[PDB]
A and B are shown apart, each in its own frame.
Chain A
Amino acid sequence: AAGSLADLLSDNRPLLKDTIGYLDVIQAPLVEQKQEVSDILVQMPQALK
């Protein structure tokens, strides 16, 4: 298990770093407008029906 985790980290560390950066840049606008998302999710079922 120690060897397998070491290998997994050694292979996926740069990709995980880039993934975290991309996730941060994705989620920042969503958090900036976290109330508009709630409002549209509340409103959409009525429009769909």
Chain B
Amino acid sequence: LEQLRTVSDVLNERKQDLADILTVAGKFITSLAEALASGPYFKVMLVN
């Protein structure tokens, strides 16, 4: 219970960071997986 306390404390101090992770990672996974959908490859825009 004590080690769970310290783990949960470091998690609770960074609960806003967990929420930010979920928020900013749930809004681009479809967009990122879109590129590698056409075929057995992934498109790239080689600017140079």
Question: In the complex, how many residues of chain A place their beta carbon closer than 8 angstroms to a beta carbon of chain B?
Answer: 16
Residues of B with C-beta under 8 A to A24 = 3
Q: Which residues 1-49 in A have Cβ within 8 Å of B in the complex?
A: 23-24, 27-28, 30-31, 34-35, 37-38, 41-42, 44-45, 48-49
- Decide if A34 touches B21 in the complex (CB within 8 Å): no
- Decide if B14 touches A48 in the complex (CB within 8 Å): no
- Decide if A41 touches B21 in the complex (CB within 8 Å): yes
Q: Which residues 5-32 in B have Cβ within 8 Å of A in the complex?
A: 6-7, 10, 13-14, 17-18, 20-21, 24-25, 28
Residues of B within 8 A of A (CB): 3-4, 6-7, 10, 13-14, 17-18, 20-21, 24-25, 28
